[PDB]
Amino acid sequence: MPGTKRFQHVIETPEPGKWELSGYEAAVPITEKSNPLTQDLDKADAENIVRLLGQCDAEIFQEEGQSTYQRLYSESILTTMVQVAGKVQEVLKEPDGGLVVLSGGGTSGRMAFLMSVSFNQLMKGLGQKPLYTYLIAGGDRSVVASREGTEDSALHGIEELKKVAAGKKRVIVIGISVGLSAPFVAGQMDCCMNNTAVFLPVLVGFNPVSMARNDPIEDWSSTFRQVAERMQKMQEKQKAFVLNPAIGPEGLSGSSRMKGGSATKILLETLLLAAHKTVDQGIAASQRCLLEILRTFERAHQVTYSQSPKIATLMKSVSTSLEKKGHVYLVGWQTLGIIAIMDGVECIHTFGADFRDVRGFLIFTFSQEDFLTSILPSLTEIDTVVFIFTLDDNLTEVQTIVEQVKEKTNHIQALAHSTVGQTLPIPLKKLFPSIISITWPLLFFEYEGNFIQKFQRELSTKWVLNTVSTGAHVLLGKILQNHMLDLRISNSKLFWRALAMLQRFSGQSKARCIESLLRAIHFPQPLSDDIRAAPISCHVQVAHEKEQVIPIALLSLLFRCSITEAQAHLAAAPSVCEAVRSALA
Ligand SMILES: C[C@](O)(c1ccc(-c2ccc(S(=O)(=O)c3ccc(N)nc3)nc2Nc2ccccc2)nc1)C(F)(F)F
Ligand SMILES: O=P(O)(O)OC[C@@H](O)[C@@H](O)[C@H](O)[C@@H](O)CO
Asked: Segment Important for interaction with GCK: which positions?
């Protein structure tokens, strides 16, 4: 029938109460699952939120139970990390013709960028040619942009990969798809497998291969699941690797920028840092070298979330300043200003939030006096500015900008990384009364840029910014239980997630849910057979441009009514959230 092939993979909606025993629920990839810890995130206050997400973040480090999924500290995973590290060594030994690529859509691509820099720095500091580079879906514009649509072409991924692999003789391609989902990555991995002489694919994600996307890719004949299954076969001969620990579901469902990206860093910095530090020691990388690093990262979570109460406060002040109609600024020096930018930009697609809502700033890249003249004018009684730095930064530049912002804002808090025994200049740094000083033990670094300290610091900041930005929005009633219902359908993955949410909250049939969403997307044109049979990109291209698509579709399903009727109902309610919540009642 028209539509049958396109929606073929979509499991039917369970009957009421048999949600567990239809095993629709066991096919929901871990990455898309609803984390049980956050059943009621829409009711937690700011302090609970920080707890529950700090709890969710912890599941990264949790170990394997006794018929269940391999985890970060499982021996199969660590054994793979070792083997990969070893393959990076082969390349570090022969850098003439060598290249290491870290590739990913969205936050995966963002994380790939940061990392590729760090390991480029580390070889600069040893007088070695930088071997790292990155690819991000939609080119480098994408790194600091919201560009969700760009992950859907396998050909694109392959083109970006063909460019960079120039006339290199040995290329390690680390494709990062948290959900083992993005066609961008898919293509690359497959391309790698077709030319084993030159390429080595390593696939990073956080689902078992059996939960890897298996829907058709528009410009490609295989699915991620097939590509991934075949890589798993080649691992037996060390010509491909799959690094896929389960870190548990995201505190906000499907928001892989959070635990996903954190784990992407934890997992890869660890592995690569081990590989470098062990080559010039003349030693092979062991599980012991990796575990030192893993446990340092695990400490970082404890170090970070021990400031919970103050994190909860920054949230309350970001929540509030948005609750009015004010803006929030994240002002960071070096890498922590990037991470600031990346958090803020992600708020657009993740929350339907304007690019001013939570903006990030690096000293997007507007230096001291430039920031002073340009932006400082636009601040207000209600805004919130957030300073993010270390004590090794140049706090003469820092103190200045605070002094100025203080005048016009007064809602300023800060995020300050320090070793023990560094002290915050100006005993009257009461510009910040109750800082978030995050103070790091002394650690036995050997490399000159002290890269372990770097990686700890980024991640700690990422957890903070992530929890804060996420929490503020949750507090404002915009999340439904632990799902973003009202997202913007801007790629195929989000189209399927929308459909899954309609099935969940309506309980009504797959076919009904599909019919309601397509109607919502394409209204005022009614369902033709063309539309039914169209490639999901057609739906995406049309949905991406409209507002409240998913809520409207859900309202039509519950009230068993037309798009016309549901639109008019909506418009005649105080808000989208209030409308949906009481239709659900
Ligand atoms: C938990 C929940 O039921 C839900 C939420 C989302 C999804 C869902 C979202 C996206 C996708 S996806 O096709 O884009 C995808 C993404 C990554 C991957 N490795 N494989 C497939 N699938 C979802 N559900 C699903 C996928 C495969 C089999 C059964 C269910 N399914 C269920 C809801 F409450 F959110 F509705
Ligand atoms: O890491 P994946 O599963 O390949 O997905 C990559 C991107 O879709 C993902 O990073 C998305 O852009 C973020 O907003 C996650 O909230």
From this structure: 197-198
